[PDB]
Design a protein around this ligand. Structure first.
Ligand SMILES: *Cc1cc2c(cc1C)nc1c(=O)[nH]c(=O)nc-1n2C[C@H](O)[C@H](O)[C@H](O)COP(=O)(O)OP(=O)(O)OC[C@H]1O[C@@H](n2cnc3c(N)ncnc32)[C@H](O)[C@@H]1O
Ligand SMILES: Cc1ccn(-c2ncnc3[nH]cnc23)c1
Length: 457
């Protein structure tokens, strides 16, 4: 049912990503119509003498060529007929079956227009594929409570490295199910994902509050994630005090970002619920900024920033992004060590998560502590300036050197490792053994997601 394409435009797109650095070209781009087509192509690669590389591409949001298939075939998973959301009395809630290449923004519009339902756990940006985020974790402000997107999926259909289609879940082929989740595309291509859904709120009360003290900012973020009244989203950002009294206390400001979701039924209590939660906090008085907007508009906020950047030609620039999971016991050292020390290129995100919401059976790698932070350096290099990218890449290495030199047991999220001993150290002995065993079972020829640079033929 599917077709091989050698169109130079398809080739060029399959040879690039959001990172803007890695440029490994495939021989062809495959456009499947169904799971059977993906299975046929992977089947061909597995049975070939050479054993060519096959990689699924979602929306091409990788930073270092993770979706690239050097001299092989890139499967363009992007998209008729869609499954409707379903209620189950056994699970006590709703779900929806989606194609692995579906963008979260399309999943959202679909579930909202069919029963006013929506996923519970997000990414900050919705123009990402389901297969792509489920191969990593999928994190945003809801993860502290609902867990990442890999903790909100009931079932998958996976095309293995042997071209076999397998239905898997916690009760059916669990080794494959848990291996694939956070598995970096190593054990198969997700063709179907059964996403957990909740009744969607209609509106969002979006709040931002400032702090000049890192100890007070982290203590409040940690208290908020332990919360029965609670915010529905908890994030934060590090900002230079200059780019805005508060300056006399600190040269670095920390912005706390929270939301309170509501609908027709809770609209009467939202204002007081917010006031009660805010009163318990230690943010700077008079620094509260509030916005009231529809749920879709809040979830799509990064796409709005994207459209503005595209107009100025500031979107298709190199993005040397660095994402770290930092144990909460070592977060204080980041303030003078990195935020005031090493530091750039754009926003610096920071927020804690609860490890108990992450299933330890998955392939995802988190620090060995109950509370850990995402610390994301979301830099953009200057357009057409290779030296700007080089200076930012040196800044990222200095951050990694700092973690190593002070014994911070940080773990990279969307890991950019390429050497065997780096991957061994990332996973650790027990997780590395489990990962290698899963590779021998599901992708012995190392056909899939070779751009990750973990295994070789
Ligand atoms: C660009 C970007 C990324 C991003 C983000 C905002 C922007 C502007 N915000 C994020 C956030 O808030 N939370 C989060 O967890 N991640 C965030 N990201 C990063 C993003 O999740 C990743 O880039 C991820 O890779 C998803 O992006 P995409 O869907 O574009 O996928 P890819 O980059 O093409 O491929 C990633 C890897 O997975 C393999 N792959 C792709 N599709 C599949 C399927 N269906 N099955 C199995 N493996 C698959 C690729 O081969 C590659 O190895
Ligand atoms: C290139 C760009 C512009 C805004 N962002 C983001 N802003 C806030 N949170 C984000 N999360 C992921 N990308 C984000 C990324």
């Amino acid at each position: 049912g599917g077709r091989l394409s050698v169109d130079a435009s398809d080739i060029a797109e399959a040879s690039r990503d959001f990172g803007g650095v890695a440029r490994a070209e495939p021989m062809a781009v495959f456009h499947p119509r169904a799971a059977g087509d993906v299975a046929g192509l992977v089947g061909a690669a597995f049975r070939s003498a050479r054993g060519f590389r096959v990689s699924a591409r979602g929306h091409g949001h990788s930073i270092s060529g993770q979706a690239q298939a050097a001299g092989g075939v890139v499967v363009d998973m992007s998209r008729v007929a869609r499954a409707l959301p379903v209620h189950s009395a056994a699970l006590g809630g709703h779900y929806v079956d989606v194609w692995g290449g579906e963008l979260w923004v399309d999943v959202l519009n679909w579930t909202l227009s069919h029963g006013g339902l929506a996923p519970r756990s997000w990414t900050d940006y919705l123009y990402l594929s389901v297969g792509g985020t489920l191969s990593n974790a999928g994190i945003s402000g809801q993860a502290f409570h609902h867990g990442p997107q890999i903790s909100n999926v009931y079932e998958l259909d996976v095309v293995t490295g042997k071209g076999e289609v397998v239905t898997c879940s916690e009760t059916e082929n669990p080794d494959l199910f848990f291996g694939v989740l956070g598995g970096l595309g190593q054990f198969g291509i997700i063709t179907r994902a059964r996403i957990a859904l909740e009744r969607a709120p209609k509106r969002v009360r979006w709040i931002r509050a400032l702090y000049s003290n890192f100890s007070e900012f982290t203590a409040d973020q940690e208290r908020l994630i332990s919360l029965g009244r609670r915010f529905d989203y908890v994030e934060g950002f590090v900002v230079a005090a200059e780019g805005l009294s508060l300056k006399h206390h600190s040269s670095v400001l920390y912005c706390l970002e929270v939301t309170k979701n509501y609908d027709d039924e809770t609209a009467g209590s939202v204002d007081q619920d917010v006031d009660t939660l805010l009163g318990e906090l230690n943010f700077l008085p008079g620094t509260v900024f509030t916005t009231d907007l529809p749920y879709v508009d809040f979830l799509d906020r990064v796409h709005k920033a994207e459209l503005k950047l595209r107009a100025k030609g500031m979107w298709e620039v190199p993005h040397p992004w660095l994402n770290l999971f930092v144990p909460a016991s070592r977060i204080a050292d980041f303030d003078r060590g990195v935020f005031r020390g090493v530091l750039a290129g754009g926003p610096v995100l920071i927020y804690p998560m609860n490890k108990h919401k992450w299933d330890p059976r998955s392939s995802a790698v988190t620090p060995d502590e109950e509370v850990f932070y995402l610390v994301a350096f979301l830099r953009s290099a200057l357009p057409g300036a290779p030296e700007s990218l080089e200076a930012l890449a040196r800044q990222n290495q200095r951050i990694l050197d700092f973690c190593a030199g002070t014994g911070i047991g940080a773990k990279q999220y969307l890991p950019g490792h390429k050497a065997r001993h780096e991957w061994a150290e990332h996973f650790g002995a027990a997780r590395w053994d489990r990962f290698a065993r899963l590779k021998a079972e599901f992708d012995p020829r190392a056909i899939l997601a070779a751009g990750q640079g973990i295994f070789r033929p």
